[PDB]
Design a protein around this ligand. Structure first.
Ligand code: ATP
Ligand code: ATP
Ligand code: MG
Ligand code: ZN
Lengths: 604, 202, 62, 69
């Protein structure tokens, strides 16, 4: 098959001469696009007469009803749109598409050239005829007999500009998606276009392709591959220091990953605590509401308050309160709601089911209830906006106390690891202590991930033992890695992620805020980043800290001077890679991360 | 009574040594184990074949006038890609509890369960870990009727196994004495594993 | 520690150990360990290499 | 052309520079390897060696004779 979409204006001889580019082969079918001007009529009848004889190829005529002359530019835009729609319809494939641009206005010829470039044409040529015809023999062929003489005397020089593949994005545009309104009027088609969606789509595709080509160079320094389609101004905005105030709305819309969150530290005070208490099944067993006063300046205390005070700041919720089934259900539902409000796409929650067990409720019952509450909340949400929740069991080390809880939690984790293989799963154990290796060989033999929770100590021996004795795949609150170059290098080489909680670290330990340049006491976030460590930003306790994931990502701008927004994107990518998810959850998380909010303040 | 009769393995041909149950010569332990290869993990992965085993066994104790029994099971050997070891144990317990409750309280044999953590000939101690964790989980779950009352150490690794957690949750320990005259083995069971019963200590 | 440019010593490969008592010093200094499997078709050795020897590469783990 | 055509599904390519490859070449890359016909392409590949014993390199032949000499 070989088609030729020609253009006709005041001179109808272009089509008959263009009908001989191949020669004896000709074209199996040809079409013409022109205007509706009355002057184009006699040319149309002449073309019909020419088509009467030599009726080997297929014939049709299409004129635009809304564009005749060249007295407007909006008419030019409409002509371009109609030309593109007609090329899409009468030319499904550019491989079998031969385009002639001899006929039509100058703007018309440019339109054919541009359409060939955008949508591709197997071959574009320009038909020429010697003026050795007509009266005086000084005019080109303009009649049936003269046209035949030119075709019979080899009086047509054809200039072929070569194949033209076009754009990959503009070659898969089917005409049905861009219908053209036609009205049969005799042996010709009167085509009209309804909307200009085609031009806008083409312009957007071209701009996106230009952005992709401009960002191609540095495609290995972008944490998310989908960032290459951003305008260069946006990619420059992404390399500037994060603004804690103007960037609040951009951070709030980011799809975030939560890896360090405690179930029992969520609704520790305020209205959430009262809602949780109201949800209680039996309101009589509810313990009295203790009076826990927040330190002045909370959530930013004037001075650090250490870990014991921080933990005691959340005694109105947890072990004594979550033993009520209704309170536990309300806790889980409100935590999922809070995760949704922050646009978290993947979260790992830490729970202590043994702490919530009673006479009639074993740790297994509590764990199953928590898992099913989270799964039901997940299923009640659209998949496009659904946060995936997995569970980690916290095996804490009491101060010379109940060591049976550690065994119970480890056994519970080992059982729940095989119990559930879909939806909400139990993916690891959090070892808040030892900062014991014999207790955890069974954990490693069943494929459970281990995360070690450092606390109330600044020793590197604990980190060394967690990395090489407990085989931890993540470290929590490892704020003293720089104090041992060997340990820092090992952590970077082995890909062990470090969980940092800005507000929790600031309130428990305290760091300089809003300084000018990195001193010897600054937050180690950027020092870790420059060392190759996979750093993730978390919340620790939503309630005790009063800070969300957005709040922590924003406070990183005051704890770390000059931290850029590409750095927060890198932290999110690090969290996505460090999650204990499986292939399906990892694919879903990566699909969610590929949707970064577009900046709004890229004007300085 | 198999639920999926299209998955039941063919009934292998296993010949019993002449004179069974009284053989003319001791056939050893390896040949003894193979004699029961037509049942167990081969058949018990079927949800329907695991009920007949639990019910055809409870009515064998009733016909023998047993008043209290402790059955040794390996729920991890019957776990498929859809039935986890906890699902198998959850079912074995309720197939015995249901049978117990359907018998008059005058001739009712009370059944308790022991989880067998058998040493494997691959060094594969993942099965041991799953059984010990399963026993600890089921120790608190059920307080009445059929209960998981202990673990069966049918077999140095167990001394590196850290069997302390089973002791901290109130589970009892039973140890099969090996086929060798390992007097040093019975010594470590009593004092290392804190075993309260010894199996085949001849 | 002697060499820091050009050709360097980047680790050691254990060739038949499951016994990491005498390997804490190598992990302390940051040397990477690759554990080289033997002719035995055992999986316990792989578990010991991954979790006892803290190996980062495995040889002939078929 | 090549980069834009292969942009979709660029995370499935080990080396990101393979995007600029012609689509026919990528389709060839997705076809089963041919030992007889693909000797030159594999021979010209930049490779990484992580398991090579120094003591088992020249154990017989002209290389052994050179080492001994
Ligand atoms: N920031 C922290 N640092 C160290 N340990 C923590 C931290 N937050 C919580 N924990 C430990 O985690 C254990 C369980 O976590 P979770 O916050 O869910 O507590 P819980 O089950 O409500 O119990 P409780 O608050 O009574 O200790 C707590 O007992 C505490 O020991
Ligand atoms: N494929 C292999 N599998 C296992 N061990 C191997 C293999 N190749 C070499 N070795 C062992 O590696 C050890 C050290 O490696 P290398 O070959 O460099 O030492 P060598 O002293 O030169 O070797 P040899 O005397 O065995 O030829 C040697 O003792 C050899 O036994
Ligand atoms: Mg058997
Ligand atoms: Zn914490």
């Amino acid at each position: 098959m070989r088609i030729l979409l020609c253009s006709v204006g005041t001179s109808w001889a272009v089509v008959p001469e263009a009908m001989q580019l191949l020669g004896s082969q000709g074209f199996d079918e040809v079409h013409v696009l022109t205007t509706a001007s009355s002057k184009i009529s006699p040319g149309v009848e002449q073309l019909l007469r020419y088509f009467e004889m030599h009726p080997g190829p297929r014939f049709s005529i299409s004129r635009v009803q809304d564009f005749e002359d060249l007295r407007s530019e909006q008419d030019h835009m409409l002509f371009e749109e109609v030309l593109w729609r007609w090329l899409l319809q009468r030319a499904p494939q550019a491989a079998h598409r031969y385009i002639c641009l001899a006929g039509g206005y100058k703007t018309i010829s440019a339109a054919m050239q541009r359409a060939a470039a955008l949508f591709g044409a197997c071959e574009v040529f320009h038909v020429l005829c010697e003026p050795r015809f007509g009266p005086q023999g000084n005019r080109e062929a303009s009649t049936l007999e003269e046209v035949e003489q030119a075709i019979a005397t080899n009086a047509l020089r054809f200039v072929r500009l070569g194949p033209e593949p076009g754009w990959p994005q503009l070659r898969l545009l089917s005409a049905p998606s861009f219908p053209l309104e036609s009205t049969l009027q005799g042996p010709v088609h009167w085509v009209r276009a309804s909307d200009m969606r085609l031009r806008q789509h083409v312009e957007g595709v071209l701009e996106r392709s230009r952005h992709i080509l401009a960002a191609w160079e540095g495609i290995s320094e972008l944490p998310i591959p989908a960032l290459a389609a951003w305008p260069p101004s946006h990619l420059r905005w992404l390399h500037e220091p994060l603004d804690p105030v103007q960037d609040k709305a951009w951070v709030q819309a980011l799809p975030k990953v939560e890896l360090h969150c405690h179930l029992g530290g969520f609704a520790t005070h305020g209205e959430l605590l009262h809602k949780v208490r109201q949800e209680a099944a039996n309101p009589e067993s509810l313990p009295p509401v203790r009076a826990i006063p927040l330190p002045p300046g909370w959530p930013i205390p004037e001075e650090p308050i250490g870990l014991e005070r921080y933990m005691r700041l959340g005694d109105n919720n947890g072990s004594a309160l979550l033993k009520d089934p209704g309170c536990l259900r309300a806790q889980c539902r409100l935590l999922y709601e809070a995760l949704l409000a922050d646009h978290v796409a993947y979260a790992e929650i830490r729970c202590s089911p043994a702490n919530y067990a009673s006479a009639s409720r074993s740790p297994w019952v509590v764990l199953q209830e928590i898992r099913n509450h989270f799964q039901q909340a997940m299923e009640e949400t659209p998949e496009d906006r659904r946060c995936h929740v997995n569970l980690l069991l916290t095996a804490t080390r009491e101060e010379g106390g109940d060591r049976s809880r550690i065994a119970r939690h480890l056994a519970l984790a080992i059982t729940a690891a095989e119990h559930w293989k879909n939806g909400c799963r139990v993916v690891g154990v959090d070892l808040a202590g030892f900062e014991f290796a014999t207790d955890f060989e069974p954990v490693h033999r069943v494929g459970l991930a281990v995360t070690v929770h450092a606390g109330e100590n600044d020793d590197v021996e604990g980190i060394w033992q967690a990395v090489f004795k407990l085989s931890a795949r993540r470290l929590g609150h490892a704020l003293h890695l720089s104090r041992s170059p060997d340990l820092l290098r090992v952590v970077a080489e082995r890909g062990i992620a470090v969980e940092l909680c800005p507000y929790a670290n600031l309130q428990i330990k305290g760091f300089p805020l809003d300084e000018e340049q990195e001193g010897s006491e600054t937050y180690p976030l950027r020092g870790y980043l420059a060392a190759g460590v996979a750093v993730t930003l978390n919340t620790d306790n939503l309630g005790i800290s009063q800070a969300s994931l957005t709040d922590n990502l924003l406070l990183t701008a005051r704890l770390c001077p000059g931290i850029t927004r590409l750095e927060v994107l890198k932290t999110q990518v690090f969290a996505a890679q460090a999650a204990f998810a499986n292939q399906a959850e990892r694919k879903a998380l990566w699909a969610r991360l590929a949707q970064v909010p577009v900046p709004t303040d890229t004007e300085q | 009574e198999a639920a999926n009769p299209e998955s039941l393995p063919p009934v292998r041909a296993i010949p019993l040594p002449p004179g069974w149950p009284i053989p003319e010569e001791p056939i050893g332990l390896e040949r003894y184990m193979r004699l029961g290869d037509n049942n167990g993990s081969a058949l018990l992965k079927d949800p329907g074949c695991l009920r007949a085993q639990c019910r055809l066994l409870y009515e064998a104790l009733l016909a023998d006038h047993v008043a209290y029994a402790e059955i040794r099971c390996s729920p991890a050997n019957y776990a498929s890609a859809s039935r986890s070891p906890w699902v198998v144990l959850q079912e074995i317990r309720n197939h015995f509890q249901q049978a117990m409750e359907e018998t008059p309280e005058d001739r009712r044999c009370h059944v308790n369960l022991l989880l067998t953590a058998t040493r494997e000939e691959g060094g594969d101690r993942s099965r041991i870990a799953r059984h010990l964790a399963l026993a600890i989980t089921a120790a608190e779950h059920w307080k009445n009727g059929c209960r998981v009352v202990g673990v069966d150490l049918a077999g140095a690794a167990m001394f590196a196994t850290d069997f302390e957690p089973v002791h901290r949750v109130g589970l009892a320990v039973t140890v099969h004495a090996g086929e060798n005259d390992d007097v040093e083995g019975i010594w470590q069971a009593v004092f290392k594993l804190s075993a309260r019963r010894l199996g085949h200590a001849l | 520690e002697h060499w820091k440019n050009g050709c360097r010593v980047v680790g050691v490969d254990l060739a038949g150990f499951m016994f990491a008592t005498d390997f804490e010093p190598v992990h302390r200094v940051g040397l990477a360990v690759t554990v080289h499997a033997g002719e035995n078709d055992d999986v316990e050795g792989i578990w010991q290499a991954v979790f006892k020897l803290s190996a980062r590469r495995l040889g002939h783990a078929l």
